[PDB]
Design a protein. Structure first.
Length: 233
């Protein structure tokens, strides 16, 4: 008996299906590609990856063959793209063994961890929480969800981001420091994973600023493409 209608849950389109995947929590892995860790001035051999979150309602589903018109955000001069493999949780649990971890992943999609980099870097230098840099409005564009019933659990796949026809990021998901299986196991030590949860597994090297009017195209092998154009605030 709600006082007023809640926000409907953000629901991902599912490739080749009329059914949608309702989003619960949004987990993100930071510094999960050695080359990216190094370009940000960190040592991936002496410090491990780490976890942060975005609200479900920062997730913005983008249909295949469509372009998201994404408003440049408030309170930033330094707005970064980050292409990422997204794993969707179908089966929950705690302290999930590495050997069954990928069995908890219902599907995969192309995602962007859009970032107010100036704000994120200011919070990092002040030892403060990163939410103003990472957990902001429409900060997680994502493509259709591909079921592991279709695409299995890929350990190899090219991951790429182009801006205005220019390659900016090109790596392979097999470069993840914590693989999908490791990230699901380790996340499950700190939180009970549940169906609907998404994991943004981190971004390869080549992250950069994007300005209004510029167009981005991300792709992962087997997972199609993600088209986003940055427009006015
Ligand atoms: Mn990221």
């Amino acid at each position: 008996n709600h006082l007023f209608a809640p926000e409907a849950p953000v629901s991902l389109t599912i490739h080749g299906s009329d059914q949608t995947f309702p989003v619960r929590r949004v987990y993100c892995v930071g510094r999960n590609y050695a080359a990216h860790a190094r370009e940000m001035g960190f040592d991936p051999e002496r410090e491990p990856p780490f976890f942060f979150c975005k609200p479900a309602d920062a997730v913005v589903p983008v249909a295949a063959g469509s372009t998201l018109e994404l408003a440049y955000p408030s309170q930033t001069g330094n707005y970064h793209y980050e292409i990422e493999l997204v794993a969707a949780i179908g089966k929950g649990g705690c302290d999930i063994p590495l050997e069954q971890a990928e069995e908890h992943v219902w599907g995969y999609a192309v995602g962007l961890d859009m970032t107010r980099r100036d704000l994120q870097m200011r919070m990092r230098e002040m030892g403060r929480p990163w939410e103003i840099g990472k957990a902001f409005d429409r900060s997680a564009p994502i493509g259709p969800l591909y079921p592991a019933s279709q695409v299995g659990h890929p350990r190899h796949a090219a991951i790429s981001l182009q801006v205005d026809g220019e390659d900016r990021q090109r790596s392979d998901i097999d470069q993840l420091i914590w693989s999908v299986a490791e990230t699901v196991s380790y996340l499950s030590r700190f939180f009970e994973l549940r169906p609907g949860d998404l994991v943004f597994t981190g971004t390869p090297e080549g992250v950069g600023a994007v300005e209004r009017g510029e167009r981005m195209l991300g792709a992962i092998d087997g997972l199609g493409e993600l088209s986003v154009r940055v427009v006015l605030e």
